[PDB]
From Swiss-Prot, chains A, E:
Function, as annotated: Non-catalytic subunit of the V1 complex of vacuolar(H+)-ATPase (V-ATPase), a multisubunit enzyme composed of a peripheral complex (V1) that hydrolyzes ATP and a membrane integral complex (V0) that translocates protons. V-ATPase is responsible for acidifying and maintaining the pH of intracellular compartments.
Main location per the UniProt record: membrane
Recorded topology in the membrane: Peripheral membrane protein
Species annotation: Saccharomyces cerevisiae (strain ATCC 204508 / S288c)
Subunit structure: V-ATPase is a heteromultimeric enzyme composed of a peripheral catalytic V1 complex (components A to H) attached to an integral membrane V0 proton pore complex (components: a, c, c', c'', d, e, f and VOA1). Interacts with RAV1 and RAV2 components of the RAVE complex, which are essential for the stability and assembly of V-ATPase.
InterPro entries per the UniProt record, alphabetical: ATP-synt_VA_C, ATPase_a/bsu_AS, ATPase_F1/V1/A1_a/bsu_N, ATPase_F1/V1/A1_a/bsu_nucl-bd, ATPase_V1-cplx_bsu, P-loop_NTPase, V-ATPase_su_B/beta
Organismal lineage: Eukaryota, Fungi, Dikarya, Ascomycota, Saccharomycotina
Record protein name field: V-type proton ATPase subunit B
Residue(s) carrying Phosphoserine: 109
CDD domains attached to this UniProt entry: ATP-synt_V_A-type_beta_C, ATP-synt_V_A-type_beta_N, V_A-ATPase_B
UniProtKB/Swiss-Prot annotation, chain B:
SMART domains in the cross-refs: HintC, HintN
Catalysed reaction, written as an equation: ATP + H2O + 4 H(+)(in) = ADP + phosphate + 5 H(+)(out)
Positions of post-translational Phosphothreonine modification: 107
Source species: Saccharomyces cerevisiae (strain ATCC 204508 / S288c) (Baker's yeast)
Subunit relationships: V-ATPase is a heteromultimeric enzyme composed of a peripheral catalytic V1 complex (components A to H) attached to an integral membrane V0 proton pore complex (components: a, c, c', c'', d, e, f and VOA1). Interacts with RAV1 and RAV2 components of the RAVE complex, which are essential for the stability and assembly of V-ATPase.
Function text: Catalytic subunit of the V1 complex of vacuolar(H+)-ATPase (V-ATPase), a multisubunit enzyme composed of a peripheral complex (V1) that hydrolyzes ATP and a membrane integral complex (V0) that translocates protons. V-ATPase is responsible for acidifying and maintaining the pH of intracellular compartments.
Claim: Ion transport is one of the keywords in the record: yes
Protein name listed in UniProt: V-type proton ATPase catalytic subunit A
Curated annotation (Swiss-Prot), chain D:
Subunit details: V-ATPase is a heteromultimeric enzyme composed of a peripheral catalytic V1 complex (components A to H) attached to an integral membrane V0 proton pore complex (components: a, c, c', c'', d, e, f and VOA1). Interacts with RAV1 and RAV2 components of the RAVE complex, which are essential for the stability and assembly of V-ATPase.
Subcellular location: Vacuole membrane
Stated role: Subunit of the V1 complex of vacuolar(H+)-ATPase (V-ATPase), a multisubunit enzyme composed of a peripheral complex (V1) that hydrolyzes ATP and a membrane integral complex (V0) that translocates protons. V-ATPase is responsible for acidifying and maintaining the pH of intracellular compartments.
Protein name per its UniProtKB record: V-type proton ATPase subunit D
Naturally occurring in which organism (per UniProt): Saccharomyces cerevisiae (strain ATCC 204508 / S288c) (Baker's yeast)
Full-sequence range covered: 8 to 52 of 256
Anything else known: Present with 8500 molecules/cell in log phase SD medium.
Family from the record: Belongs to the V-ATPase D subunit family.
Source taxon at top rank: Eukaryota
């Protein structure tokens, strides 16, 4: 019938019981302009919609409604790469015409792929601080935790730029002979940043290989969050159906989170813990749904979501819920940034707990696990000692602590300092780790089994 | 019957629904999705649907089946990986071509076309029977019969029919009991509501220790069987790795491993790793796997699916306890069960009461731990079973005094620490000596005392060394090292030896990561024999530095204790350790003089 | 020995005064501001839900 | 700036650290100063 | 009328308004299962009940309700000592009824049968540390505040069992010539832990002296709050009518805080900070109202509540509010527990607001108040002196502090370390005290009169 | 209407005066450090720290004893109830420092003694009942010493009521109405000349 | 304010307003917020705390004819003794500067105890000629 109300951007339509869940409605406004909307809820002789398009143009009773009859599904095809899309599907290149071979649920309730084969072979980044410390295996969801007051967007662009030199690094490792695709999902991203991102892919030559779904925050909130979900589904098509390897970079998770809070405020749902919802977890798990190695056991979808800590803490709702769903984390420091070490990653609270499983032989060493353990322990002591120097004085310090102070500086300025376009192989990165480690003799190193130590010292 | 009033979230509300209970099984819509009516507010019933809604229409019919939502406990439980309400995942891979079925499918609880071996029990014609009695068995482990098929509670009468040994189907009769008229015919499986406990004749205190195998766990306090245990986390503490280590090392009859709302990658890890692992006693086909029955639920499955997880798993453990088997239940993470209770709270849109957590949260936790425990088996034959629960926790409320961690530490009886910072630096599983207690220690240690170990005396002194170490640690930081006496240096120095050998645990099982309880006592015996000598020398005159040079050879050995194996000295302790006690004495006499 | 004592007393005095003035009141100011924020979250949460 | 939620456990222990430190180093100081006075008098003579 | 609905713990019944408040109703289920509840709220043709057992498994048109016509009361008798009850006052004997001589309402009494008279006679717990330094008196409440780094129930058991072995020692001293009784309430205890308490009373012979009311961790939150009210009324009967001094042991108050916090003081209503009600005070105050000296003037109920501090916190609402109503506290610590000290009781953060003044003279000597000044002082100095030893050594350590260093050790290892079933009278406790002070000369015990000191040294 | 020997006055309504004065008159405590170092005022407002039975109840009992004011009104806002018992028993054995007789201190004291266990109405009404009574004695031309123990408890009586009813309390979980209520209470007390033609001087401290 | 701007307007007068105490006024707003269907924002005080304070501060400045004015010195006592508490923080932003009084001075017996460590007034080269 007609709009009962509009409260914020959300619309209450008083209509009949033929729409399904996540079924599209088409709002006919008397301005000669159609807007589209998706049912958040269907309820008795009413629907709660948030409109994807516009935000005004509403009338009280001069509105007319009609149901689209079709629930939101993605047209996914063999060629989706080398094209620029928006999640709203607007023409900026492509967007409404993108080819189709299947229509797939965003929900991902039919196919739902999930590992049942262990995180297999190594994935390269050419960053020592990612590969050595945490290590990445196919099908892994390891997150990059960044901060605000520092550019989180810049750390996403370095990962983008060095990505796709990565496929050659894997080629070298052998047992990877299949296509590489990047599926890039932008949500809450600025117009200037968007252009940057486009640039990174282009310079490597991965533009041809990448599919972009773009949303900005001037598009309605519900749309913004659907945009990466559509993109993961497209990734899933590539991964399962034509047995390709997909790395999907999903930025910005804070932005996904921002939407969640706004949505719900007079529905059955209502925002819970700390002003961020109590069902915030489910929303993150839908993104995690389409992650792991795919069925048939070739190809994988690997996922590195980009998360920003807004006050530089893990106790805040956005980093806290996420890190639990993840299987370790990578920690970005403000202090290495200010000094001018790029990319600035502190390894102290960084671990990925499937490091053992991720690494294997023939592409990574057996010493690899051992090597990470050594760097943490010394790096940790060095930090602890620098703090005591400050208050009490150098009467507390000892000779061992001097080795440690010296070890902090060598680690920060050699291991963590590298290019934005300077890619490496995994074997080199372990060789440089060793160099730093040479300053403690064998008897003060005990984070490696002594058997392994004698070989590589 | 009913008409769908709202579909809101993955939560569905349906009108015209009366005569329905709060445990009633209901099928939602005309796609017939699996559901359960959790609560009812008026004519409108609030139903959680354990599959997602991606095109569920309003006004479609909802049919109450006229019975509760239960799970089948019967044949086919082991060597199989299941979902939160149990439907063969393995069958689903092949048929549905997907890891779990599409929304709007229903698959049967067990394989229906698979036929099983019935053996008749000790209850024949005209013998009286009651719940938890063994009417028969199936075989689901090679060396043993791991599964006793028992009569459900509140089932009684005298037997008209016992089926003789042979192959039957699980839907076909093997038992009939007559009570109040014909009570029913019974089949190989039985249904039991999973949200509801399985009764016990009586509980008898945990007093039987049985390995954990991990070096640290065995050391601070003894290992326990029939106990209840909290181990911290943060989902970056090598929680998966110790779980796999834990499965191999426990020598219990049966294990239930429950992934509450896990990664999917973690579920791959265990499903793949278990058949490669050799059972310590004597192997079986695909050894560890065959003795494990798995409920493997991911977090990416709805909130409904994750809440049935913890429940069905404990119900398999309680049946097994009643069967006459000692069970290890490993739950990872109990904080993910609690995370789920929050999600249902947000979806239902109820007010919090527990720091951003629902009203029912404290009570639900408390109820879970009580179902677990050491007991004398339910039934008239009387057998021994126990369930030891090892439960992982992690924060979930942004606080260090969070509702999940606080209410669980109350109901738990063994508490062994774990620090995130140590674990990353390489000391997993980690342990915090001042943030630990165990109530079972007193009886268990006395058990190890009688078998050979001098165990009680050692345990108190290990903690003591570590206590003084914390006090020392603050002085050491501030003033420095240049002020501590000879005695104090030793305290730190023996503390190093314990930190090195127990807290660190090298490998899955490589570097002899498996320590038996008797080996652990020997590892400890070597350090404290050294401590007392070491304390006497400084006191009788001998510089810290001088004493360190002169100890030399015996110190390197005790340092090297973890690579060594007890299977080449005796079979559980090392001849090398016995020789170590003589060497200590000899060294000491030279060095003092 | 007297001369080494002479040196050490100056250092040691600096430290007692340094913990006293800079560290302890910084620690008071921080602990209070975050306690009050923390409490505000628990109470406002209840108030929004109740309303 | 300072953490949004739960610095308090940490800050509690920071508070404790500070406070123990002041007491002990004032005792260490107290012993040095006490001995020094006696030595000063020996020396003048 | 039939059940309208159940939303969480709270149950909505459409049943008519003619029942009174506190009125027991019976839920008649079609499953042959009868469950009882007490009306939380009675309203106009609806009632809200929380059910004593279960909350789910009821229907809305196959479960029907009946009103008993009798409100929540306990059948009170003195044949209840030596008998095992649950948390409704029903037996778990598996034999004969409770037995009545009166029916007393449980709410903090209908009539309030107490008077306010200052304490004047010692009550003894059979452990030196509690009794000398922070004495217990008739009608005075001093809780044991312990933490989840302790085996808090196990310590709780030691206090309780050693009680009433005191009564023959007091009898020779002539402080108690009228009987001892124990009322024990378990709230939120484990099946195994519950068993330990019981076995400890059998061994001591204290089973005959106690009645146990049991609430299990798996029984409803409303069942749990009913549990101490049963124990105190039963104590009030013994105390008032037959003149017994009755010592009531309530472990664990922390579970009690949990039940209220969860529902029955946060039903839908707004609670204060950290989810723990602001009227949690008001509830605590009900328990304290039914405690104290009663008519007879040989009758009192002395109370030892056990509160377990979540993580050892001093900013959490639970120890702070409770702590205002009670007259001091005994603080237990983690530090002593590690060292191998049992029971690990420290008397320095602890306080008993009225020491000598609370207790009497006639069954305790006059020296108790004086001795407590010396033991407290030395103990304080003693903590500090040990930290100093560590740094300075013993080549420049102070003489006064050197004796205090040794004093810290003995105070722990003999005055605070005792057996499991080792019982010590108050006279005895006093003698041990002087023995520890005997090492110091008179010139370092200068805060005491030469007459008293010359006699007692 | 008809009048009696007593009169009623609502508990939250304070009794009236011709005008209030600035006090310049001390307490009659005679506590030497109290008088000399930071002089006692009668017609004043005074905050004293406590923590319960580490001295604070002790000084309130001392204050009662040394004092020899025309009236003294003793308010237990919500105390431990051992302490209330103690106040009652000690006072008639004690002696007034003006050398009066007939259960000395107790004769000059009128006691509103609520322990925190006793109903919440009685706790909240306690300060109110004391101030109105005291204020009337100010109109009678009597210098009153008003002893309250404790306002921390008293703020708590209010917070309890607030959560039960289902209104929102404000800062630190303690109510909105709190601040205006604390404030009214201290400003009510002070030195005044009584209502009516005689103009007798009283004080409430 | 109405009294003060009327004198200032009509007969072109500088009126100086001493408004004590700002938190006492906050206190009352706080009680008719609890009593309203309003939710309190920052630290138990009104989420419309801005509109209140701002009503006072709009009236201040030169009034028509520019020989009449209303000049304000408002007086604030810090309810929790913190300069992070919302009351001083909004108030300070809306006003032009602040004058700080420090407790350590007061005790020492300095008069006036005006500690000039944060005391600054924005118009300093725009308040002089």
């Amino acid at each position: 019938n007609t709009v009962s109300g509009v409260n914020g951007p959300l619309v209450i339509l008083e209509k009949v019981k033929f729409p399904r869940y996540n079924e599209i409605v088409n709002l006919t406004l008397p301005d000669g302009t159609v807007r589209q909307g998706q049912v958040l809820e269907i309820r008795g002789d009413r629907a709660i919609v948030q409109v994807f398009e516009g935000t005004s143009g509403i009338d009280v009773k001069k509105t007319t409604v009609e149901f689209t009859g079709e629930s939101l599904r993605i047209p996914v095809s063999e060629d989706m790469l080398g094209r620029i899309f928006d999640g709203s599907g607007r023409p900026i290149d492509n967007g409404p015409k993108v080819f189709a071979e299947d229509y797939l649920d965003i929900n991902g309730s039919p196919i739902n792929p999930y590992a049942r084969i262990y995180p297999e072979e190594m994935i390269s980044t050419g960053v020592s601080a990612i590969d050595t410390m945490n290590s990445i295996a196919r099908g892994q969801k390891i997150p990059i935790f960044s901060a605000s007051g520092l550019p989180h967007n810049e750390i996403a662009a370095q990962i983008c730029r060095q990505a796709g030199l990565v496929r050659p690094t894997k080629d070298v490792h052998d047992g990877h002979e299949e296509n590489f695709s990047i599926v890039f999902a932008a949500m809450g991203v600025n117009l200037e940043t968007a252009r940057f991102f486009k640039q990174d892919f282009e310079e490597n030559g991965s533009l041809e290989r990448t599919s972009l779904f773009l949303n900005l925050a001037n598009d309605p909130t519900i749309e913004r969050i659907i945009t990466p979900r559509l993109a993961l589904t497209t990734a899933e098509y590539l991964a399962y159906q034509t047995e390709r390897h997909v790395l999907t970079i999903l930025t910005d998770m804070s932005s996904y989170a921002d939407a969640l809070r706004e949505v719900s405020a007079a529905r059955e749902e209502v925002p819970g813990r700390r002003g961020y919802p109590g069902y915030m977890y489910t929303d993150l798990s839908t993104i995690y749904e389409r992650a792991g190695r795919v069925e048939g056991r070739n190809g994988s979808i690997t996922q590195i979501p980009i998360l920003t800590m807004p006050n530089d803490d893990i106790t805040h709702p956005i980093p806290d819920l996420t890190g639990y769903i993840t299987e370790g984390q990578i920690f970005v420091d403000r202090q290495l940034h200010n000094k001018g070490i790029y990319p600035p990653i502190n390894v102290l609270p960084s671990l990925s707990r499937l490091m053992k499983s991720a690494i294997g032989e023939g592409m990574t060493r057996k010493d690899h696990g051992d090597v990470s353990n050594q760097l943490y322990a010394k790096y940790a002591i060095g930090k602890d000692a620098a703090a005591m120097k400050a208050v009490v004085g150098e009467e507390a310090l000892s000779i061992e602590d001097k080795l440690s102070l010296e070890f902090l500086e060598k680690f920060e300025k050699t291991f963590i300092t590298q290019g934005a376009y300077e890619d490496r192989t995994v074997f080199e990165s372990l060789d440089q780790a060793w160099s730093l480690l040479r300053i403690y003799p064998k008897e003060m190193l005990n984070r490696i089994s002594p058997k392994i130590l004698d070989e590589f010292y | 019957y009913g008409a769908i009033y709202s579909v809101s979230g993955p939560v569905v509300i349906a009108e015209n629904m009366i005569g329905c209970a709060m445990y009633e099984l209901v099928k939602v819509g005309h796609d017939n999705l699996v559901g359960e009516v959790i609560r009812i507010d008026g004519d409108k019933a609030t139903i959680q649907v354990y599959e997602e809604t991606a095109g569920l229409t309003v006004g479609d019919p909802v049919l109450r089946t006229g019975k509760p939502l239960s799970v089948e406990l019967g044949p086919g439980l082991m060597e199989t990986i299941y979902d939160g309400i149990q439907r063969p995942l393995k069958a689903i891979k092949e048929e549905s071509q997907s890891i779990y079925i599409p929304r709007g499918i229903d698959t049967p609880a067990l394989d229906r076309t698979i036929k099983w071996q019935f053996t008749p029990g000790k209850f024949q014609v005209g013998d009286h029977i009651s719940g938890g009695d063994i009417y028969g068995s199936v075989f689901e482990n090679s060396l043993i019969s791991s599964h006793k098929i028992l009569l459900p509670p509140r089932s009684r009468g005298t037997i008209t029919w016992i089926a003789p040994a042979g192959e039957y189907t699980l839907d076909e009769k093997i038992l009939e009991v007559e009570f109040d008229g014909k009570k029913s015919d019974f089949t190989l499986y039985h249904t039991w509501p999973v949200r509801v406990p399985r009764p016990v004749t009586e509980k008898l205190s945990a007093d039987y220790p049985l390995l954990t195998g991990q070096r640290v766990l065995d050391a601070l306090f003894p290992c326990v069987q029939g106990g209840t245990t909290c181990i911290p986390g943060a989902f970056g503490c090598g929680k998966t790795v110790i779980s796999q280590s834990l499965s191999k090392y426990s020598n219990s009859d049966a294990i239930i491993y429950v992934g509450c709302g896990e990664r999917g990658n973690e579920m791959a890890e265990v499903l793949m790793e278990f058949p490669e692992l050799y059972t310590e006693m004597s192997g079986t086909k695909e050894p560890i796997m065959k003795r494990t029955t798995l409920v493997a639920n991911t977090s990416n499955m709805p909130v409904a699916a994750r809440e049935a997880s913890i429940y069905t798993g404990i119900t398999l453990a309680e049946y097994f306890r009643d069967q006459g088997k000692n069970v290890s239940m490993i739950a990872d993470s109990s904080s993910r069960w609690a995370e789920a209770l929050r999600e249902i709270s947000g979806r239902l849109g109820e007010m919090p009461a527990d720091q951003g957590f629902p009203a029912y949260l404290g009570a639900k936790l408390a109820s879970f731990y009580e179902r677990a425990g050491k007991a004398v088996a339910l039934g008239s034959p009387d057998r021994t079973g126990s369930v030891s629960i090892v439960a992982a926790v992690s924060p979930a409320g942004g606080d260090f005094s969070d509702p999940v961690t606080t209410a669980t530490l109350g109901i738990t009886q063994v508490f062994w620490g774990l620090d995130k910072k140590l674990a990353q630096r390489k000391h997993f599983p980690s342990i915090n000596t001042s943030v630990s207690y165990s109530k079972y220690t007193n009886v268990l240690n006395k058990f190890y005392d009688s078998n050979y170990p001098e165990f009680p005396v050692l345990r108190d002194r290990m903690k003591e060394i570590l206590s003084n170490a914390e006090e020392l640690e603050q002085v050491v930081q501030l003033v420095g090292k240049s002020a501590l006496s000879d005695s104090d240096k030793i305290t730190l120095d023996v503390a190093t030896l314990i930190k090195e050998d127990f807290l660190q645990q090298n490998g899955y099982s490589t570097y002899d990561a498996f320590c038996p309880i008797w080996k652990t006592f020997d590892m400890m015996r070597a350090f404290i024999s050294y401590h007392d000598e070491a304390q006497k020398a400084v006191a009788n005159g001998a510089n810290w530095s001088k004493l360190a040079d002169s100890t030399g050879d015996v110190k390197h050995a005790v340092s090297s204790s973890k690579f060594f194996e007890p299977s080449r000295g005796e079979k559980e302790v090392h001849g090398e350790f016995e020789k170590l006690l003589s060497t200590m004495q000899e060294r000491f006499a030279e060095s003092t003089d | 020995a007297f001369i080494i004592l002479d040196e050490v007393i100056k250092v040691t005095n600096r430290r007692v005064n340094a913990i006293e003035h800079v560290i302890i009141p910084r620690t008071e100011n921080t602990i209070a501001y975050i306690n009050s924020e923390l409490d505000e979250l628990d109470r406002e949460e209840f108030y929004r839900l109740k309303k | 700036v300072f953490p949004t939620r739960m610095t308090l456990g940490l800050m509690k222990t920071k508070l404790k650290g500070a406070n123990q430190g002041y007491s002990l180093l004032k005792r260490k100081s107290e012993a040095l100063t006490k001995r020094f006075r006696d030595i000063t008098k020996r020396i003048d003579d």
